[PDB]
Amino acid sequence: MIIPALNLIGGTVVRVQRDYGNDPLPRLQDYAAQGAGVLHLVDLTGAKDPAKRQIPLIKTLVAGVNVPVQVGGGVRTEEDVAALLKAGVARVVIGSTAVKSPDVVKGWFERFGAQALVLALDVRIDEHGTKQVAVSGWQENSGVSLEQLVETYLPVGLKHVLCTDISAGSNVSLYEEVCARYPQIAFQSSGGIGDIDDIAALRGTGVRGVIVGRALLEGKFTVKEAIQCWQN
Numbered sequence: 361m362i363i364p365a366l367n368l369i370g371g372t373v374v375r376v377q378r379d380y381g382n383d384p385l386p387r388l389q390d391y392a393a394q395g396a397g398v399l400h401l402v403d404l405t406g407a408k409d410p411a412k413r414q415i416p417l418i419k420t421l422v423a424g425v426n427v428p429v430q431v432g433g434g435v436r437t438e439e440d441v442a443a444l445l446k447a448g449v450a451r452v453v454i455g456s457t458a459v460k461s462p463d464v465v466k467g468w469f470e471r472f473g474a475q476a477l478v479l480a481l482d483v484r485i486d487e488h489g490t491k492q493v494a495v496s497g498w499q500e501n502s503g504v505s506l507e508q509l510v511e512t513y514l515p516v517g518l519k520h521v522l523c524t525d526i527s528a529g530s531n532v533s534l535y536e537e538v539c540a541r542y543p544q545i546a547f548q549s550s551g552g553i554g555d556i557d558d559i560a561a562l563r564g565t566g567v568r569g570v571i572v573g574r575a576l577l578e579g580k581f582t583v584k585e586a587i588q589c590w591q592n
């Protein structure tokens with residue numbers, strides 16, 4: 361599936377910065393109108409300040425579409441997850457916290473269920489060829505590999521994993537490897553999509569979701585054409 365994405369800062373759509381206007385709902389509705397089944401939102405305001413979590417806006421955007429929306433952005437506490445889900449969010453995307461407190465997040469899986477949580481992994485292939493997990497782009501590796509963290513959450517029923525290469529299209533070999541090793545996990549690719557050929561390159565990798573952000577905002581292609589290429 362194609363997963364259109366938007367980055368939000370105080371109700372503003374931004375390139376990750378560059379402004380794209382403060383009217384995200386018509387964009388999302390048109391995305392869904394072209395056949396999109398899932399949408400993706402990153403709350404950068406809430407990621408910076410937890411008390412600034414754009415819950416009312418998210419609640420409006422969710423109510424404005426007919427498709428499940430997965431939302432992430434500095435999700436730190438069990439209360440953050442509950443608040444987002446209560447706002448109508450389908451799945452909560454968790455990156456940093458899932459790396460720093462695995463035992464706590466594993467408790468979240470037990471309470472909320474694996475259908476409501478998405479494990480986001482920022483991955484850098486280091487000097488040794490290890491798929492290192494990082495909490496952000498401006499910080500060093502954490503000393504934990506993708507395999508270690510994935511197999512840590514498998515006992516609590518891990519299903520959805522968002523994998524971003526932060527070390528030009530998407531890293532095809534990367535996704536081919538991880539999707540084959542963990543066939544019981546629906547992997548989502550993220551970052552790298554520059555044109556329509558980048559989507560075609562991921563068709564046989566085994567990924568179940570392709571997240572596209574910029575390419576849509578810059579008119580490289582439409583969601584419709586993306587889905588057409590994806591379904592071949």
Ligand SMILES: NC(=O)c1ncn([C@@H]2O[C@H](COP(=O)(O)O)[C@@H](O)[C@H]2O)c1/N=C/N[C@@H]1O[C@H](COP(=O)(O)O)[C@@H](O)[C@H]1O
Nearest residue numbers: 365376432433434435454455456480550551552572573574
């Ligand atoms: N400062 C940030 O930019 C940031 N901070 C966190 N995230 C993501 O949020 C999620 C949760 O992060 P935490 O706040 O829990 O650590 C993870 O997936 C992170 O990668 C961030 N990523 C934002 N942009 C995303 O990166 C990808 C780029 O795609 P492209 O346009 O097609 O090229 C898309 O998925 C975009 O939505």
